[PDB]
Design a binder for this molecule. Structure first.
Ligand SMILES: [Mn+2]
Ligand SMILES: [Mn+2]
Ligand SMILES: [Mn+2]
Ligand SMILES: [Mn+2]
Lengths: 206, 207, 207, 205
């Protein structure tokens, strides 16, 4: 059974970049919905697995096929938002401060500068044509190199792709404050990105 | 734990429309792979579920997300092939004979004739751009009306879309015999379609 | 060059069901974005098509492939919103009034009642996991039968699936008024659905 | 108008790794189908484009949406196969010989060895659940770093992802020789991969 994670900051601590009203809805309603949906999906899979074991029919296999979509969607919603809150922080907790150490070295070597990486990520965010996410990732399969990837809906990065910074591009992440002005949101959010957490994720490779 | 279903006919019973060599590989290799993959994926889900209950971390949920794809793909492969074998039959067992009862009525009313429904299905099959399936379905949500739908890979028809006839359009379903000539396969298969099973599925409104 | 369509109603005319604030942003900003993106994509097509004629290389075909997604997405956004505005009307212009003629007959025959069709549509809307649309359609391939289809992003219904009622499920269609309470929006919108236009589309069997 | 490209080798030249029977069908039938489909789709879109200029209706935009699917699929089929023939070669033309220069240095730095990159690519190929491709790519957006990406159907790599080696995982690429033994085909194909072409693509970007 999963639950909402503890936040490291108060709902209004990311103002003026992200409003307290958005954070409260985003956490208490949206993230909670994924929590509930994931727990439900996993319970349903347990029931269907037990059913399939005693009656291993195509009919019962078809029922299991039907709920894996919910496990993927709600599981992704649960995990993506957990990553998101952990890579946000108010300026008083280091939000917006550049990364140091090995991550900073890799960023300059690969993208030239942090600003160039941020600009690339904002282009990737703008290019999400629907609901989705951008992630700055470390790829463990190609020698640990940085990349920026897009996902749709609540799809996430798995396997050798370790998420370092997750940025939510669903309209509920910004609409109450920015309405249609999504580039203003993508620009603003970097002021409260926690690069210390990004560096930790980079160093651990988890 | 799932297993290969019993066949209602021998591998060579659908000759010359579908070769015995294809049926043998299709069943003993391809369908078996989905059986194994599905069993493995469900066991893996179980293992991860037990772990999540003790450590409900985002990291463990992430692992479960990865396994979902395999449950979907192999579960689909298992289910779709089971449907496929059950809607094929040699002529001696009624393969190629038209449906009767309520299904026959519905077909003429919606498509004009069985031949027109078959033509539409062959167009849908030709339109699969990659691996996939076409299904003649009964839609329980719109008053039980017939339709033809396409799926990709091992996606299948679920919920209110009840499969009546499943036709495999993966290249392994025909390539050894027809090579690139996929429309020849799509034309040929109707000679061994089991419309009695289709009628049964239509009446039952379920698998 | 495509442009924003004329609206048949004032921005605030669908209140209380959809706020004037939402309609104004939805039309002047969101729909405009798709108009701009589609015009840009088509111009880019033309440039690349000309280039390909002179230099029919894989590299140039690769550039053409890259632009296809923008044509699809923005084309869909343009088309879907045009459909949407035309199937909404204030109560004073008949919004919420049931369809008549051949469409009303089809609805009762397939769904039992208009209420049952609306409930199905709301379930399909609720099932959109991300941004998307639901469409009540007439399927020209199966004898003209009604159905409800979901799409994601700005995917749309093409070919034999003729849209009769389009309902937008993107968060921008409701969030300023309803926030997370998407089912309340899906319930409310029917009060301003223009079933006369749905009937017109049903009879025409085209856009 | 696109056409089938010239091959640099005879149909049977890749035996015993890929049969002449397969190459002949794969080129003269399958690739030709994509050539024809792409030409048809581009012509259709041009007609619709000229029409939209005079009648910029939702009805006409809807027709254009329908055609783009064929542009993507057949365009991908056309380009992916062009890449494929150019990154295959018989042993007599250097097939199977390791890359050199900058590409070889990048491979060792990122993957440890060519063998390790090949093993990774084979895992990516094995993971294609349906028809599709694996590509070894140079990513121009992250400093030119190598990666391996999977695509489905005739989807391809575009923009900053430069294809260096394309490997076809559609069943028609192997079934006549390997039938269900897809992993054996993935293992075998490296004996006729043209890494000289891969190195050229890497250096050019
Ligand atoms: Mn969110
Ligand atoms: Mn099959
Ligand atoms: Mn909209
Ligand atoms: Mn091929």
């Amino acid at each position: 059974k999963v639950t909402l994670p503890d936040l490291k900051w108060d709902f209004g601590a990311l103002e003026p970049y992200i409003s307290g009203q958005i954070n409260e809805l985003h956490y208490t309603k949206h993230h909670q919905t994924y929590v509930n949906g994931f727990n439900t999906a996993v319970d349903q899979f347990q029931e269907l697995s037990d059913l399939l074991a005693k009656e291993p029919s195509p009919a019962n296999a078809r029922k299991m096929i039907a709920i894996q979509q919910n496990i993927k969607f709600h599981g992704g919603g649960f995990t993506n938002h957990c990553l998101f809150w952990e890579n946000l922080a108010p300026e008083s907790q280091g939000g917006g401060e550049p990364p140091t150490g090995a991550l900073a070295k890799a960023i300059d070597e690969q993208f030239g500068s942090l600003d160039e990486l941020i600009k690339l990520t904002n282009t990737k965010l703008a290019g999400v044509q629907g609901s989705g996410w951008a992630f700055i990732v470390k790829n463990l399969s190609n020698g640990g190199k940085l990349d920026v990837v897009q996902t749709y809906n609540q799809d996430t990065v798995t396997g050798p792709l370790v998420p370092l910074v997750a940025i939510d591009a669903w309209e509920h992440a910004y609409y109450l404050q920015y309405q249609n002005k999504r580039p203003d949101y993508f620009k603003a959010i970097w002021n409260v990105v926690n690069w210390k957490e990004a560096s930790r994720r980079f160093d651990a490779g988890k």
